[PDB]
Amino acid sequence: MREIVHIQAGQCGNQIGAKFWEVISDEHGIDPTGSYHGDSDLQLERINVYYNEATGNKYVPRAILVDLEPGTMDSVRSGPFGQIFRPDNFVFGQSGAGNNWAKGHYTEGAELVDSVLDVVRKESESCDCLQGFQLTHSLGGGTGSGMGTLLISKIREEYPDRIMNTFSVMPSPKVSDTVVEPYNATLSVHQLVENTDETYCIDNEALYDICFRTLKLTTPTYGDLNHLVSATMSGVTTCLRFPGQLNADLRKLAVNMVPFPRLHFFMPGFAPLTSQYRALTVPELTQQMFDSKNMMAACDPRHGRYLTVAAIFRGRMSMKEVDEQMLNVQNKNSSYFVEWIPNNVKTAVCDIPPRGLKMSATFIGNSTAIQELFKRISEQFTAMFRRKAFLHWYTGEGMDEMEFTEAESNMNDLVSEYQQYQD
Amino acid sequence: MRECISIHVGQAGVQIGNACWELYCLEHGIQPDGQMPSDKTIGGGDDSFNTFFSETGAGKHVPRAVFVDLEPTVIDEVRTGTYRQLFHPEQLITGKEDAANNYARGHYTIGKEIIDLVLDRIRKLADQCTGLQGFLVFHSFGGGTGSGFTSLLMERLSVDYGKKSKLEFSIYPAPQVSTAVVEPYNSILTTHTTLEHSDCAFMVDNEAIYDICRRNLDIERPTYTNLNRLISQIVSSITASLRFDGALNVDLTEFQTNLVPYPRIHFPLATYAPVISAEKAYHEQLSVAEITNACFEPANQMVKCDPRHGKYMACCLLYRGDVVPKDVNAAIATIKTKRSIQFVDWCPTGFKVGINYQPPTVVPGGDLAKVQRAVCMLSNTTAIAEAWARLDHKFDLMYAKRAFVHWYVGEGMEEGEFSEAREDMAALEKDYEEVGVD
Amino acid sequence: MEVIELNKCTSGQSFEVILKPPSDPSLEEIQKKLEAAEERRKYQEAELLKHLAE
Amino acid sequence: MYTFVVRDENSSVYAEVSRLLLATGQWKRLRKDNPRFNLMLGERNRLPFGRLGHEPGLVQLVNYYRGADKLCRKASLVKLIKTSPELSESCTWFPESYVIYPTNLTDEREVFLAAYNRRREGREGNVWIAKSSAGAGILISSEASELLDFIDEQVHVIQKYLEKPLLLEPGHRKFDIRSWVLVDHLYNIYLYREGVLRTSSEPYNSADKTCHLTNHCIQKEYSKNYGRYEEGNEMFFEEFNQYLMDALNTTLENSILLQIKHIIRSCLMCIEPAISTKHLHYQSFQLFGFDFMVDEELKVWLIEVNGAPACAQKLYAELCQGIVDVAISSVFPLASIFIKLHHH
Ligand SMILES: Nc1nc2c(ncn2[C@@H]2O[C@H](COP(=O)(O)OP(=O)(O)OP(=O)(O)O)[C@@H](O)[C@H]2O)c(=O)[nH]1
Ligand SMILES: Nc1ncnc2c1ncn2[C@@H]1O[C@H](COP(=O)(O)OP(=O)(O)CP(=O)(O)O)[C@@H](O)[C@H]1O
Ligand SMILES: Nc1nc2c(ncn2[C@@H]2O[C@H](COP(=O)(O)OP(=O)(O)O)[C@@H](O)[C@H]2O)c(=O)[nH]1
Ligand SMILES: COc1cc(S(=O)(=O)Oc2ccc3[nH]c(C)cc3c2)cc(OC)c1OC
Ligand SMILES: [Ca+2]
Numbered sequence A: 001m002r003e004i005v006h007i008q009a010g011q012c013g014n015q016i017g018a019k020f021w022e023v024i025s026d027e028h029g030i031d032p033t034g035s036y037h038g039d040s041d042l043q044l045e046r047i048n049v050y051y052n053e054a055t056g057n058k059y060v061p062r063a064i065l066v067d068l069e070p071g072t073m074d075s076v077r078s079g080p081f082g083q084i085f086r087p088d089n090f091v092f093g094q095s096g097a098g099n100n101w102a103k104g105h106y107t108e109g110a111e112l113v114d115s116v117l118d119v120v121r122k123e124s125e126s127c128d129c130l131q132g133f134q135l136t137h138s139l140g141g142g143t144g145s146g147m148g149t150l151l152i153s154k155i156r157e158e159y160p161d162r163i164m165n166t167f168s169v170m171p172s173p174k175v176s177d178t179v180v181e182p183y184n185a186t187l188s189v190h191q192l193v194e195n196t197d198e199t200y201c202i203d204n205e206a207l208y209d210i211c212f213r214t215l216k217l218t219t220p221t222y223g224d225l226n227h228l229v230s231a232t233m234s235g236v237t238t239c240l241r242f243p244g245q246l247n248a249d250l251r252k253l254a255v256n257m258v259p260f261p262r263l264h265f266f267m268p269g270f271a272p273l274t275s276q277y278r279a280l281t282v283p284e285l286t287q288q289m290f291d292s293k294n295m296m297a298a299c300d301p302r303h304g305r306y307l308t309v310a311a312i313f314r315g316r317m318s319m320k321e322v323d324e325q326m327l328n329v330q331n332k333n334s335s336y337f338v339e340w341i342p343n344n345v346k347t348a349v350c351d352i353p354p355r356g357l358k359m360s361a362t363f364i365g366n367s368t369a370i371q372e373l374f375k376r377i378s379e380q381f382t383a384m385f386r387r388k389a390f391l392h393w394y395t396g397e398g399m400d401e402m403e404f405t406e407a408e409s410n411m412n413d414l415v416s417e418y419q420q421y422q423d
Numbered sequence B: 001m002r003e004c005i006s007i008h009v010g011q012a013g014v015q016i017g018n019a020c021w022e023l024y025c026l027e028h029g030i031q032p033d034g035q036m037p038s039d040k041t042i043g044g045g046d047d048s049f050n051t052f053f054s055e056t057g058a059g060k061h062v063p064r065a066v067f068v069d070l071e072p073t074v075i076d077e078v079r080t081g082t083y084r085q086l087f088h089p090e091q092l093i094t095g096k097e098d099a100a101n102n103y104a105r106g107h108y109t110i111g112k113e114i115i116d117l118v119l120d121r122i123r124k125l126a127d128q129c130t131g132l133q134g135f136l137v138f139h140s141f142g143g144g145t146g147s148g149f150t151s152l153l154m155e156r157l158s159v160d161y162g163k164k165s166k167l168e169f170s171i172y173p174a175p176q177v178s179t180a181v182v183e184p185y186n187s188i189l190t191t192h193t194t195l196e197h198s199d200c201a202f203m204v205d206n207e208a209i210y211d212i213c214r215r216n217l218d219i220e221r222p223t224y225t226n227l228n229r230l231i232s233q234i235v236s237s238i239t240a241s242l243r244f245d246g247a248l249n250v251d252l253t254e255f256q257t258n259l260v261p262y263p264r265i266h267f268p269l270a271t272y273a274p275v276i277s278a279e280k281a282y283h284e285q286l287s288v289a290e291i292t293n294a295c296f297e298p299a300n301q302m303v304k305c306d307p308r309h310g311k312y313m314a315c316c317l318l319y320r321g322d323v324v325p326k327d328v329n330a331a332i333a334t335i336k337t338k339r340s341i342q343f344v345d346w347c348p349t350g351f352k353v354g355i356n357y358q359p360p361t362v363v364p365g366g367d368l369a370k371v372q373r374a375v376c377m378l379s380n381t382t383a384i385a386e387a388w389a390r391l392d393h394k395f396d397l398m399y400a401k402r403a404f405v406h407w408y409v410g411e412g413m414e415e416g417e418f419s420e421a422r423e424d425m426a427a428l429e430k431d432y433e434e435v436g437v438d
Numbered sequence C: 001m002e003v004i005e006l007n008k009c010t011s012g013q014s015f016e017v018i019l020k021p022p023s024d025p026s027l028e029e030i031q032k033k034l035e036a037a038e039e040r041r042k043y044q045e046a047e048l049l050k051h052l053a054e
Numbered sequence D: 001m002y003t004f005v006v007r008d009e010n011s012s013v014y015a016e017v018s019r020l021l022l023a024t025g026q027w028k029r030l031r032k033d034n035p036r037f038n039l040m041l042g043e044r045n046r047l048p049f050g051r052l053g054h055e056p057g058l059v060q061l062v063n064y065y066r067g068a069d070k071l072c073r074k075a076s077l078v079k080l081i082k083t084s085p086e087l088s089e090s091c092t093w094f095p096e097s098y099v100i101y102p103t104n105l106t107d108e109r110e111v112f113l114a115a116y117n118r119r120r121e122g123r124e125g126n127v128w129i130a131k132s133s134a135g136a137g138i139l140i141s142s143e144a145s146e147l148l149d150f151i152d153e154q155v156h157v158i159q160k161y162l163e164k165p166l167l168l169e170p171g172h173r174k175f176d177i178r179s180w181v182l183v184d185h186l187y188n189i190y191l192y193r194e195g196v197l198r199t200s201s202e203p204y205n206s207a208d209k210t211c212h213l214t215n216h217c218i219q220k221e222y223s224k225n226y227g228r229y230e231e232g233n234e235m236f237f238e239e240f241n242q243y244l245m246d247a248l249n250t251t252l253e254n255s256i257l258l259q260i261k262h263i264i265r266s267c268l269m270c271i272e273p274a275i276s277t278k279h280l281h282y283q284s285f286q287l288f289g290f291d292f293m294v295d296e297e298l299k300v301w302l303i304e305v306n307g308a309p310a311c312a313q314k315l316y317a318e319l320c321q322g323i324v325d326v327a328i329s330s331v332f333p334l335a336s337i338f339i340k341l342h343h344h
């Protein structure tokens, strides 16, 4: 049994995490009470990866809900699948992080981090073979950004030989809460570079554009954006949650997707983009999958090169045709794949499709074009930091200007590292 | 009677070994519960098939095999398969987490924790042998367990069984059916550390087997079951001499004598014919000359290469079925004029021929049709160096950027071991050229 | 064209046809490098904890 | 849309071929080291044939035949004709040649001396010529001691010099017929309908090496009459056929081309079982340049075969288009000028 411990921190991390558990509980036939009511035994072959079996054939998610405010977690407990989580796994504070990285990471989250690790330890001790942890959070706030990275750093100290995986939501001025989001994002990115094995870069700018340009939504809400995240998270965990001839685990993904330890930020993609009765052919799935308009990272793949690519097709389809279309993409646009990593595109097919779709495809790409995302964050960071604007919110929590300068340098170094492998 | 111990390491070794022992039981008439009705000596006997099967007091014929994998999923299929009653649980060894396609993780980190246990279980079988010939090691180049742990095992076997031969059946990596992007790294590392320990290695390129299944068996997308059932036929032909009465390749030492003139050049090229789809109603049964001629067609070789551009050092013809020596000699004279078979000057241009009257056995309901005669050719050709060149070029592309190297260093490997392993491969290609120069 | 060494039995027969005449480390050394790798592995983990302690 | 890479920058023939492929809009050129290609215009030396035909879902084609060096090198061509029963040492259209290794360095040194000494005793012409694959170094001497001492100063070969070559009357000079042959993946032997005659500009003298060697580069440097009779010392088939009808009362098709097509078929059918790519995992085509010499009795002799020939300036447009039509587009279809030499 290769179990995964799920952690969700902050408002964004819990709302996105709650939707993720709502989606995959439906896929595994788990009702909000926690009882299995499915048909196929394939829904329970690897149910232990994300669920713990309780007395009376009850399935409880191996999830830990963390926040410095009680508001969002009260919504989750009152949500559709709120009754499925362990009451013990609700670890929350009262003051909040105030959209401040320092409060999450240094002052307010420090008071709460130890109690979270006790729940992490309680879940890890009851695992036959713990393969790692996955964290859902945003980088532009204070709790998921500040405390989440603090949790990652402390979890690595206690579990150094386990895989750290994150679903990290990048801030964007298009969908913005505070002007200090570039500060929080730049501080978090430096943490993610050193302490995570795989990070799915979910850009709120990309999610907004997909809802606006593609799905034709004039005023997208966070629910609309989180619908795209749920589809992506379900897709990128399909190989973990469903049986296949690949025996997929987190470590194997990291070994094959990450050729250099710091370049572990993946571009997720999904097809078809949904917000609907016509079936999608395999050539259509492959074309949309590599299309920039289906990318969740707001980067143009044609502006860089793919180091490694992992693709997941879901539904009853011709595996012969899937290999035809995947090879067609590589042989056509071979200039967008590195020629010094042979066979850097992996394809897996799962017979069980997501809810409401006959055919779907999920894209996981380690493209050097992701530097555009870090360039965008860096430019927004520098424009404020050159004038030391809003810095008092952080120096009042004990931080120093030097820490921001180091984070800025690490951010620009990461762009330099992604740039050298583009030639 | 001199026994042989088969060792299956990693997913490829276990599943291919599962197919081989399934075929062995069919060929020897052994039932899935280990009962062999034709065996009259119950609990004993020094027959030819006893080199692969031990006999219990209850008459159950137990294979002389050990299955090793750092992950339990694959071997659990053997524990709950049709032939679960064959083995006993001491022969099946499983870990908890696999090597994650990492040679270092299977050799230095996770292999070091299980190497002593496997040797103990091997010794349990070695003590049941009156005279042990050696070991047949099944593994893949690409897998972390198949590459990392095998090389560690081969090092220890050369220390504890220094007077015993070791033969390898190795799965050469192919993108058509692959599992990792670091397989070129693992393939080079495991060949460097096993080269001085393996006496004779039969490489099976998954690309060749994949194409044969598509071309000859009309399989759209061949599965591991399709590939392994075809591979077991080649393995059965190679090991048929050890399990049946005969005079050619009767012991493991004879494989090195007949096929390996230079110790480092110990990779004979295997070619098999005929591969006939069972879906066809009745295909024309090919003649001795027709199947022998197919041995010199690249499309039937286990490794895609061009023997015309490479000198021969040795050649064996292992026929199974309705074959008489008069037909074989007539076929050879015809082939030597049409084909360009150039041996090296320091070797006699000749052919060692072995015939087994029992026709090839096929799995009931399988994809391979029953034929009245088949041949497997074992030719030590310098043309097999093309496979090393392909593998070394992919190695050089990734290593020039040091891609994925940190995963190996993080397990204790040194970056210099990569270059040391690669320079040995460069020397191996030099040795092949020095023998195949015009 | 010459056939030599014709051996026959019940299960089959074998022969050779000639067409043209011609013209290890010890257990100690294994464990030394094995434990050396575990030493570098333990050194690299100690450096990580030292970095994390800072 | 098809893909191809270029690995021979000095190939003047395939530089035009690469231009035509890009001009069709359905061929994309990649980097020389990219493995995902449909076509390869590989290099002359050390072409990596072992890496071809191993890409899933990629029909790969290369513009060279592996093992064709046995026909395009001086020593191997003589060794091939002597040993091959199809060509035989009794071959009537190949000048009597011998393989000679330098004394500093199998060898046929004593065999050359036996036939040479017979000609001196028999009052016959005993003029021979020595050359090697490392030429621009050619010695034409009547005494055998001069040729052997020059070879000692790589592997060389010595063959009987055509002491009585066919000389064009308006100038009394020697010509050199070049025919271009294209063999496709199906091993169809296509002979270009157009050829050239690298004629000389100096009168042939039986007793100097300017009127004896009819190379285009040599006739440009050592000879000052370059272009006196024909442009560039290169006569085409239409002009040369007319001269035969006026001065010899015969035609180029009958007196010369019948023998040329016979020599082309015999050489290529001989090495077919060794270079054929019918059952191989990749396909091969190659353009060859055959050099012939005609004697006074209108008999065609084979000089040597070029694996990397250069076409005439006028015929580049027609020939390179024909390469794409029958060798490249036959395998990779898009959206005659050859004579098919039928065989078995
Ligand atoms: N012919 C054949 N090849 C196989 C089979 N299983 C795996 N392979 C090949 O083996 C290579 C990977 O090695 P594996 O055996 O799967 O890995 P492993 O030995 O279990 O080691 P781990 O990395 O720990 O899983 C791939 O290139 C596959 O093509 C099989 O059943 N038959
Ligand atoms: N046996 C012979 N008799 C008469 N002339 C001969 C001859 N052998 C060679 N020659 C002359 O010498 C010239 C050069 O010989 P050869 O054809 O080997 O040169 P090369 O190798 O430079 C030609 P390419 O440019 O095709 O490589 C020929 O064009 C011919 O005129
Ligand atoms: N996609 C998505 N983004 C969100 C959501 N909630 C907040 N965000 C983004 O996250 C940032 C705010 O972080 P937040 O989660 O509120 O901070 P925290 O609660 O203190 O950890 C802003 O950039 C928002 O755009 C959500 O539900 N979905
Ligand atoms: C947990 O997520 C996944 C894990 C895996 S894996 O365990 O087989 O790792 C591998 C193995 C070989 C590889 N080659 C390349 C280029 C990437 C790669 C990844 C495959 C996936 O889909 C293809 C996954 O996506 C849901
Ligand atoms: Ca407090």
Ligand SMILES: [Ca+2]
Pocket (backbone or CB within 6 Å): B039, B040, B041, B042, B043, B044, B045, B046, B047, B055
């Ligand atoms: Ca018995």
Ligand SMILES: [Ca+2]
Pocket (backbone or CB within 6 Å): B158, B162, B164, B196, B197, B198, B199
């Ligand atoms: Ca040994």
Ligand SMILES: [Mg+2]
Pocket (backbone or CB within 6 Å): A011, A141, A177
């Ligand atoms: Mg908020």
Ligand SMILES: [Mg+2]
Pocket (backbone or CB within 6 Å): B010, B011, B071, B098, B099, B143, B145
């Ligand atoms: Mg495995």
Ligand SMILES: [Mg+2]
Pocket (backbone or CB within 6 Å): D136, D215
């Ligand atoms: Mg010349």
